[PDB]
């Protein structure tokens with residue numbers, strides 16, 4: 001199993017697809033994106049990698065993407081899918097029951113609260129209930145077959161607020177708020193807990209990490225990361241969180257750290273081929 | 287008993303029902319002649335009037351000038367004198383047993399016009415127009431003056447409100463709300479103009495504020511649980527009731543109740559089905 | 571005063587012109603241009619110095635909202651930089667209360683400000699004060715009775731007719747009676763103890779009407795309308811007569827300069843600028 005990292009930003013928008021194998025610490029150099037992107041999000045469904053949204057930041061000039069592309073590792077080749085109803089930069093995604101859910105993000109000055117769903121068998125996007133709050137730089141995680149949107153930016157305020165999506169009822173409920181305000185945080189699920197790592201609070205790029213216990217309904221600080229970072233890639237691989245790249249106010253990171261929850265500590269396990277931020281990250285299943 | 291006439295869900299509705307705020311029960315009364323959404327309701331001389339609105343079938347949209355009349359006894363609607371113009375997204379208030387029609391729209395025509403109705407004669411007579419063209423306007427009556435609050439003018443949603451003195455027959459602009467609202471629930475309680483919900487051109491609202499006539503100041507209070515515009519509003523014995531509306535995607539059945547003593551909301555039932563743009567009134 | 575200044579503006583791109591009109595003998599002096607072109611800036615005079623606040627640079631190769639504050643010295647004919655604002659502010663409003671310059675609202679990209687900050691020229695420092703109740707860009711500002719009035723504007727989605735008032739001693743904002751007409755980018759000033767709101771845009775048409783606020787009656791009253799429709803107009807008072815300079819009227823940029831005589835209650839076109847422009851910052855040498 002591999003950890004994929006697509007696109008991102010370094011001086012201009014990137015189009016790299018690379019993969020990291022954690023069994024031997026070795027990097028792979030696969031087929032590049034058709035159009036460069038940053039602020040996209042990645043996910044895996046039935047052995048295919050999907051790249052959703054983001055923005056093409058060239059020097060002349062900018063374009064928010066509504067595209068859905070599909071990489072087949074058997075053929076090493078990208079293929080266009082049906083686009084989203086609207087452009088979505090700094091987007092969140094989750095996978096529930098083999099359906100991709102695109103969450104918030106931005107199209108220019110428009111900050112979305114709307115959410116839509118993709119069915120890979122039919123190749124069609126369909127709108128579902130919008131969030132209670134507009135969010136770009138939102139971080140998404142899927143636990144107990146419920147979608148979770150955490151933090152972000154609503155056009156005016158950076159957020160510590162968090163809400164939860166019940167797919168069967170088709171509705172969003174606001175849950176307990178984070179201790180710290182975060183936008184562009186890495187959000188994922190591990191051992192029945194939601195983890196919020198890094199992000200931006202309007203002042204500083206953060207290194208603090210907090211986790212949500214759904215049953216105690218309370219956020220809890222855990223061991224912080226070595227490097228401060230926002231717009232970071234993140235994924236879980238065998239009871240271990242992996243964070244990739246991001247922005248720290250001055251430089252772009254190539255550092256990759258790995259969290260072991262048994263010992264509650266972070267450790268620098270590799271570094272990317274070049275520093276970058278706003279990557280789409282995802283990992284092959286089971 | 288609290289009536290709910292008309293509404294919208296997939297298309298305009300002809301439902302008339304009534305909720306019992308003591309034991310919580312929904313009576314199934316006579317449907318409307320014509321299905322109407324965006325209508326308003328009021329009660330004069332123990333009769334239920336459905337003023338203006340819009341029929342929205344799957345093959346035609348017709349803005350209504352019609353005024354209907356429901357008789358509690360017979361369970362039966364009676365066509366009355368129609369208004370000079372159609373008014374969808376209207377507001378009403380009753381001073382001196384006369385029904386005031388405020389604002390509304392007819393296609394692309396947004397009205398600053400207002401017309402009074404006299405049930406003793408079955409006659410609509412126009413009066414001083416408002417300073418602002420207002421659709422999705424909310425109307426409240428207090429100290430026997432009429433207040434037009436919020437609305438949409440064709441380009442801008444409004445936080446301004448204005449006051450009609452029926453003695454000199456003129457409008458004067460008052461202190462504007464802290465928030466811009468169109469299609470909000472407006473009403474009077476303990477000598478205060480309350481305003482709940484609405485759309486500001488961006489999001490549906492769940493905030494609530496109220497106007498104090500002596501201080502002339504809009505103050506926020508505790509916000510509703512659910513975001514909603516095109517809701518039905520009414521006061522029943524020292525507390526406000528809100529019914530249905532549109533949150534930006536689905537149509538609410540939730541019915542929240544505001545206690546001004548505790549300054550808190552609570553869901554005290556749900557409608558027989560989800561719907562927005564209801565005409566709502568309670569029997570005096 | 572003595573001279574009426576017009577700074578910056580827009581015609582095809584952001585301009586950097588500084589010019590001054592003498593009202594006694596009707597002459598235009600071509601003074602030194604701004605370091606940076608800007609439109610939507612504001613102008614005020616404090617202690618014989620002309621300050622140009624905020625605005626946006628609209629070049630034909632990128633746009634930049636300005637947090638800048640530059641001061642012009644008429645004696646030296648030179649523009650001197652000062653301490654910049656906490657945030658950039660396009661389409662800004664300013665008043666001067668007791669030697670300090672208030673910067674009110676405006677925009678920076680997608681962000682519409684309800685925040686307000688004050689400048690101390692003795693110290694060269696900006697300090698945030700209580701923010702407004704509403705987010706306002708293209709807001710008009712008028713100093714009366716050592717209170718700061720914030721009139722009309724645009725909140726990002728809707729054009730506004732609301733007005734609100736700032737009490738510097740309590741450091742708090744109260745909402746007052748709204749204008750009869752919605753105005754965004756109006757010209758706002760004070761004359762004979764009344765706030766005048768002239769011109770503006772209401773989402774549909776540029777305006778030519780003029781209303782005014784009597785502080786004791788708490789009411790807005792129309793007066794004689796201007797000859798030309800205009801928004802983003804500079805405005806100032808000089809010897810009991812209001813002066814309006816330039817603006818946008820839906821298709822062209824005005825060079826005309828009308829003058830309201832409060833007694834006759836009539837406007838009259840008293841000159842033209844060297845070229846038409848909108849979004850100018852305007853001030854007058856103090857009395």
Ligand SMILES: O=C(O)[C@H]1CCCC[C@H]1C(=O)N1CCc2ccccc2[C@H]1CN1Cc2ccccc2C1=O
Pocket residue numbers: 009038039055057089090137183184230231246247277278
């Ligand atoms: O608007 C984008 O999509 C582009 C705009 C150009 C800069 C890189 C993109 C960006 O804004 N990113 C990446 C994607 C993303 C995703 C989630 C949250 C935050 C971000 C921000 C994070 N930041 C901030 C920043 C400031 C200055 C220089 C670099 C960066 C940077 O990399």
Ligand SMILES: O=C(O)[C@H]1CCCC[C@H]1C(=O)N1CCc2ccccc2[C@H]1CN1Cc2ccccc2C1=O
Pocket residue numbers: 294323324325340342374375421422468469470515516531532562563
């Ligand atoms: O009025 C109308 O022309 C109709 C148009 C068809 C849908 C129902 C009517 C409507 O839109 N109404 C209901 C009455 C009313 C009263 C006050 C203020 C606003 C409204 C709007 C509120 N909205 C907006 C909306 C969009 C999409 C789907 C449903 C709705 C909805 O219900």
Ligand SMILES: O=C(O)[C@H]1CCCC[C@H]1C(=O)N1CCc2ccccc2[C@H]1CN1Cc2ccccc2C1=O
Pocket residue numbers: 580609610626628660661707708754755801802818848849
């Ligand atoms: O975003 C801006 O700052 C620039 C954008 C380019 C046009 C000039 C600037 C502008 O829009 N301004 C000037 C400053 C200002 C101040 C207050 C209120 C309104 C304005 C508007 C007035 N408008 C409107 C307009 C439309 C089309 C062409 C010209 C204009 C114009 O000049």
